[PDB]
Amino acid sequence: GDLADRFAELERRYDARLGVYVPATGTTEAIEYRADERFAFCSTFKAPLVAAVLHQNPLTHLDKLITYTSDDIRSISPVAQQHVQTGMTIGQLCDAAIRYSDGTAANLLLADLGGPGGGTAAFTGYLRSLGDTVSRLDAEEPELNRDPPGDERDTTTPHAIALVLQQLVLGNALPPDKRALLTDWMARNTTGAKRIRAGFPADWKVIDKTGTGDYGRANDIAVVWSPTGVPYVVAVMSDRAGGGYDAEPREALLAEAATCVAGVLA
């Protein structure tokens, strides 16, 4: 058979562009479909963002209290907008950015990296340090979800982001104590039940970070563990550039793409 033909059928059925990368492992070949085409990060950047903050601080930094006002809520912020009076620690912000895709938490973590562009240059530099030469973050939340389809700003490729996640969760980009925190926050994500999780059998472990944006953007990046404990990185990205800025993002496309990948990996 030809898995690329099955991904192409998904693109025609969902009226969408799909990108997939599953890095090769000890026992599998890579799966790649439009893997070197650019797609908007949307909130998937929040996983490497938390890694960047972990990398450049001791773990005691997670208790640092960050204060902010109601005027700092500029993006969908399920946790941060309930804690304006008290503030949130860096660790609480990491948790919220990954598990609730909290936009204010991400903007505050970008500010914690510091430097010009409110942390977006610093974040991009962290990706360069992991060998990612193509990805770039240019805007904060929520504008990073809203670039037009032709813009390279705030884009990655499935290939690039998969190899970033591979280094972070399964490689040695972070020491074990920091790696375990990133892994746990992804493992307890609350936003991803209908995406890669929905394509893997219940006895597979899935950890993930979702992204959604304009032009029908829907992404999910995951690490999955077989029932025998064998890990795979799975990056799935999609958009609907011909469906207008308000094209509906399709979680079901990601779930079916994931089901096709599970068929290869099982």
TrEMBL record:
GO molecular function ontology, one term from the record: beta-lactamase activity
Annotated organism of origin: Mycobacterium tuberculosis
Protein name (database record): Beta-lactamase
Catalytic activity, as annotated: a beta-lactam + H2O = a substituted beta-amino acid
Pfam family, one: Beta-lactamase2
Subunit structure: Monomer.
The Beta-lactamase class A catalytic domain, residue ranges: 19-237
EC number(s) per entry: 3.5.2.6
NCBIfam families registered for this protein in UniProt: bla_class_A (NF033103)
Keyword Signal set for record: yes
GO BP: beta-lactam antibiotic catabolic process; response to antibiotic
Biological classification of the source: Bacteria, Bacillati, Actinomycetota, Actinomycetes, Mycobacteriales
